[PDB]
């Protein structure tokens, strides 16, 4: 049982949020649209909407899509300085997973990280992804403050999932994926906005398998994140999990920044 706290819309210094980013693994764009996903977005009214798993491709009028299955999208009220695709490595750039949108005071990276697979069939490749991804982001962040959002396909610590004991050998909670995430946070460096703000808050998840009635029981995993350069922590107002938004097996997450 979890009730996301009210929206804090001012930074620690009292500056009002000026930027609201929403990110959401929609489990098929067409399906999500049929389940009234776009309606919820219109009410949320973000300045920037990142979407993962669109499986489609080809106040939010600038729209950028990348597809190989998978697929991501990035819809923005204002125009970026520059939009670019992938992470600069042939091998990792074929599955429509990353869009990089550069703005005046920061760079936004939306990602759909490769799952390790049933049986952990793709865990070796996942580790190679993780290492290239962390190198690319460290590159970006050496130049401008970074915001990374999306479905990073890993529950960091035991507090990020409802059943840590039963999932230590399943994709999303292996020691390798968890070490990989701790390494991205250390090396770029990046902080986990939600956990920074709510360090001891249990049962806050953003994904629940469609099977076994898991959402109704709250048997979930936190796989979706907003990770921020440490210099953006003074602009952090809040990082929200919209638990009650329906439309997919993942719920949206929303970030407020005062820039
Ligand atoms: Pb899916």
Swiss-Prot record:
Consequence recorded when altering residue 237 to A: Does not abolish the redox activity
Residues the UniProt record annotates as site (Important for catalytic activity): 224
Keyword check for Repeat: no
Superkingdom of the organism of origin: Eukaryota
Record-annotated membrane-spanning stretches: none
N6-acetyllysine found at: 138
SUPFAM superfamilies: DNase I-like
Positions with a binding annotation for Mg(2+) 2: 151, 153, 250
Annotated positions binding Mg(2+) 1: 25, 53, 249
Residues annotated as site: Interaction with DNA substrate: 250
Induction entry: Up-regulated in presence of reactive oxygen species (ROS), like bleomycin, H(2)O(2) and phenazine methosulfate.
Gene Ontology cellular component terms for the protein in this record: centrosome; chromosome, telomeric region; cytoplasm; endoplasmic reticulum; mitochondrion; nuclear speck; nucleolus; nucleoplasm
Disulfide bonds: 22-50
Modified residues (S-nitrosocysteine): 22, 50, 251
Annotated phenotype, changing residue 56 to A: Does not abolish the redox activity
Keyword terms, alphabetized: Acetylation, Activator, Cleavage on pair of basic residues, Cytoplasm, Disulfide bond, DNA damage, DNA recombination, DNA repair, DNA-binding, Endonuclease, Endoplasmic reticulum, Exonuclease, Hydrolase, Magnesium, Metal-binding, Mitochondrion, Nuclease, Nucleus, Phosphoprotein, Repressor, RNA-binding, S-nitrosylation, Transcription, Transcription regulation, Ubl conjugation
Keyword Disulfide bond carried by entry: yes
Free-text note on domains in this protein's UniProt record: The N-terminus contains the redox activity while the C-terminus exerts the DNA AP-endodeoxyribonuclease activity; both functions are independent in their actions. An unconventional mitochondrial targeting sequence (MTS) is harbored within the C-terminus, that appears to be masked by the N-terminal sequence containing the nuclear localization signal (NLS), that probably blocks the interaction between the MTS and Tom proteins.
Oligomeric form and interacting partners: Monomer. Homodimer; disulfide-linked. Component of the SET complex, composed of at least APEX1, SET, ANP32A, HMGB2, NME1 and TREX1. Associates with the dimer XRCC5/XRCC6 in a DNA-dependent manner. Interacts with SIRT1; the interaction is increased in the context of genotoxic stress. Interacts with HDAC1, HDAC2 and HDAC3; the interactions are not dependent on the APEX1 acetylation status. Interacts with XRCC1; the interaction is induced by SIRT1 and increased with the APEX1 acetylated form.
Protein name, as recorded: DNA repair nuclease/redox regulator APEX1
Biological source species: Homo sapiens (Human)
Gene: APEX1
